[model samples]
Target chain A: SAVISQKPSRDICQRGTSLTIQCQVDSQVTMMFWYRQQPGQSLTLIATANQGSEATYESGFVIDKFPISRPNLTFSTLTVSNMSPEDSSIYLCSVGGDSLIGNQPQHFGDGTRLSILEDLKNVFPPEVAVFEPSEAEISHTQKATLVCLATGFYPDHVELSWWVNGKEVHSGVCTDPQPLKEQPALNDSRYALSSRLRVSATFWQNPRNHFRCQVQFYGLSENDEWTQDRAKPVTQIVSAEAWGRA
Target chain B: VEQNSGPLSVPEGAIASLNCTYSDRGSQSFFWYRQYSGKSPELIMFIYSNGDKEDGRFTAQLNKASQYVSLLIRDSQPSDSATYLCAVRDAGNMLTFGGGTRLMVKPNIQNPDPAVYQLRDSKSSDKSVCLFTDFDSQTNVSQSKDSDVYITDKCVLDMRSMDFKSNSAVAWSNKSDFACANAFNNSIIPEDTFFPS
Candidate 1:
């Protein structure tokens, strides 16, 4: 196994400034790789950082925006140049995967979390809503599913948890936190997600039972690292009356 | 035809049974996959014959004689909550997936449950204090209102007790990506860090 270390686990930079990230490997390696993982998205290969040569970039990526320096087989650096809000993402370094070549399995650094600043509601909290089960779903009697939707949030770093009365519920929850089409008015930061919780109809009939959908938007710290600080979680409570009325 | 698209809820530390049935005969292989929200499905169990295969906390049994399969989760935990899918493969490479089963393992509360509140890191460190009882919560604790220590109804932390250094910031961000700066940054220079002045 290969051990890789990446410098600057994370940083938040200005819209026009640049940051250079370093990658170090304990042992010698042939070629190095870099990738960008956008928020709520898949990892896209930025370029291949080859030793003693210029980097080979992928489609939609260029040498001008992301410059790479490889002095040796064991070390490399990636410089995100002329940073913009769009340039903000998790930059990762990788090496030695079985790709028509080496036997050493792939290893990746923890990644450099970068964010470009503008403003907020950029760091806004999610607004949560819980919907009662539908007529057809309620007919199950044994299992009724309630839908909880969280929206109007920024950065998309949110957790949705369910509580029955005061205790937490661990099962029967399905959530979709996929980012929707961009709304430029929301600084391209608005996110909407929905969660479904399976419950018993008999439990829904009890007046003492309180169902709560808690949406906690993990705010970033001074270092731009994600923190558990909620300001206070955004919650929506549903009672038996709300279910019966529906 | 499949039997059920079930969402089976079982209490923690209990055995969770998941089943699948198919009408076709000559099924050769059976596989079970677990899927979580907003993520791809992961293979958890595989069976080739009509007996049982056991992995830690999980067992896959194939009853080709009865055209049935079952997955048993022993000492299940909340982390096991997810959608389980069963797949049957025949000699012709025809693979059929059974109706998915979503399982939830509720937290097992012991008799005479105690309610206590304290602030501590879940990822590391027993260095913590009880904030209240009748209680709940686990997180960073520091920064009391007006004093060197911080106390909230939910938590209490004394930042004065920690070793503060320029490089200490590195360990803070590394240890818990979820660490709250407001509690820990009171002693650090306001210019180098961002906390409410």
Candidate 2:
């Protein structure tokens, strides 16, 4: 359970190039695990390496493609050789400080996101939707949970923000950029992400107040301009008397 | 582990500094997790030794000599408001957490200064030999050496015994004509819990 650090949080490489990711642990760990999360997919174990020894790759991985080095117990490196568009992924490093114990969570470093040139050809804009709380829900909880959902996006570098009556609002907003569980086709890397906004029922009692959700998509295009999309503003219709008693 | 007392308030777009101090000199792992209302805690920052690690708008600094750690939020936003818990993992792999600091980012405020700022410049290592053993690569196939795990096939491992505490799953994908799998809790073979393999 030592602190783990991974270098190069993200990188976009050209085809046929190689990239070496470094994993530095604060303390000596007997075994270090490496995982790869392909675009729109779950994390898969790539290999396991121990100090002063060769790494043991999983079924689909080999030393040539994913070379690993554990020069010492506290540090290790994994190199992706001759990368292709398919090699683009989020590589993560993990350590099991409590390997002898069972049912404990292994410590993980924030992954390095890699993208090849060919993989950036098609960029899909996300569709944004802002869901307002229902009357019954607002009355029961005395709070409004506005859900902003963004789907059908590509490259996964999207940012979501909330706006209240033309002013940007950051408080009470929680955004999760992790892709949805359902994986899309390789060619169609559609992703679904969401953000939430919580407000007291009293705030929404004003019919003039409106909420807007905007998604800023950073597609790796040559122009480098962000593709922005906004959900239609949602105005609450709750009255003070309806939710005041509760 | 100890941190700033509860319910700290700061203005949006100001620097929010959080501090944690530990008495255990042997502690090496320091972490910061952010938790919103009615949700699970998410790991936001971690540092191993006395160094600074920065994400987009968050930074984690750890000082082993002083046994101190801190999390700094830059360009603080209302969305960044949450309860931050500071945790430390010891040599025995046990984690100790502070009572947590509840932060509120007040919108529409200009001079958002926190009392923790007056405390000023809150700043926060280990070397050890690894004793992990190699995996036993030579074991009978398709049988459980322990009652906890079974190899359903060369590509799959099933550890769904009643004694097993985890109910995670394993998933697979194909690349270069070979199959790779995603291992959840069920696929994890603890050093003391797994079958001979």
Candidate 3:
């Protein structure tokens, strides 16, 4: 069996400081991968390291902030440069071996926990955010609905509920926490998460009908709170039955 | 013989199973493979994929589908070990893999086991512990407060090789017996020794 190991199991540095992590393998292997696991977030691909050549970064990552070097088949390194408080997360090194005939599961080394702080200024904000919906509008004759959504905190948590006219309506479904989809420019390796809520009332829209969508979230402390509301004024024209009879 | 060449077609909503076999030395190993879109293939498990099926997310079912065989993934996950390849020995004692089937899973689809979600959590804390061992020496040392007894020679050494030095001069040497006593309560070293050289 081939074994992979990483150095500096963990570290903490001033915001402006930088840190380099090393990966070593017991034998020469074909590919190596670097991944980042932010708190309460899914694993994000950083780069693929090829022996005797430069590494390949994913769409959102670049070679600048997370510089990589693979001098040989058995070794590689990743450096997190000019860090901030937001840079703190677990970074991992993975190796591929000849396990199955053609395919191999990536064996990972325990990651390095990195903390970046600059001049008492921490930039790495929590990646989570909460979304709240306020004032839902429904029209029965026209069959249309609209709901407003908003989030007020950083490093958000996943605890959202939907409500209509101050009464909770069970949607009979659950959704994985929505993540921020837009790509970051400076550090390709960093990932962001966003939350969203969808409202559907195409089947029943009538004038003067009231609809409300409320969203809620719990953040770092007990005192944190956020709320957003949206209202749609319903103006129902001719109904589907009236148009068909004409 | 009739050749089975086309993609092993299993219904989208039904279970799929497939297998292959070959004769090789006992020293050779085998593996199963899976692949996914725009990504390299992944090995689902390490085995000759022969006798003794492993217990995991996917269950391998062997049938009279001629000498060839297949595997069945129950309520498969889209991310469940992509593009699996069944591979064996290579030139440098490496691996050779098989062509894989692409599995697609719809969103909100429930898996066979709700416990599988817990499986992911349980798997997260898996720590890779590596142990390097040598057979020539055995010295019993007192345990220290910070010493991880998990890596101690007594705990790490496979008992099968305890008698590795029985026929050598080192076995008769005073230091050898002392070391053996330290590792084992008594000098069971000679009785367990096998390699005379």
For every candidate, C-alpha RMSD to the true structure in Å: 19.6, 21.7, 29.8
* Residue lDDT tens for model 1, A1-246: 567888876655656778999999887766578877654343456888878888988789999999999998779999999888888887878775333334343446778777676652246566566656533334422334455556566665567778777777755554443433224345664665555555566666566677778776554455444444555322222222133332
Per-model lDDT: 0.57, 0.57, 0.41
Per-candidate TM-score against the hidden true structure: 0.43, 0.40, 0.32
Error of 1 at A174 (Å): 1.5
Rank by TM-score, descending? 1, 2, 3
Local accuracy of candidate 3 as per-residue lDDT tens digits, B1-197: 11112244333334555555433333245555554322233456654434546556566543232334455676543235234445545333433334344433322212111100000011211211111112222323222222111112221111122211110111101121222223222323333322211
Task: Put down candidate 3 lDDT per residue, A1-246, tens digits, no spaces.
Answer: 467778876554556767889999877777688877664343456888877777888788788888999998788999988887777777878777543344354656767766453432211223222222111212211212121222222222223343444455543212222323122233322222222222333322233333333333222222212232421111111100100000
lDDT per residue (tens digit) for residues A59-157 in model 2: 989999998999987789999999998888778787765443432345678778776765433455566655454344354445454555566666665
lDDT at position A134, candidate 2: 39
* Docking outcome class, model 2: incorrect
Worst 10 residues of 2 chain A by lDDT: A233-242
Q: Give lDDT: candidate 1, residue A195.
A: 57
Residue-level lDDT of model 2, residues B57-105, one tens digit each, is: 9999888887789999999865676788787878755555676788866
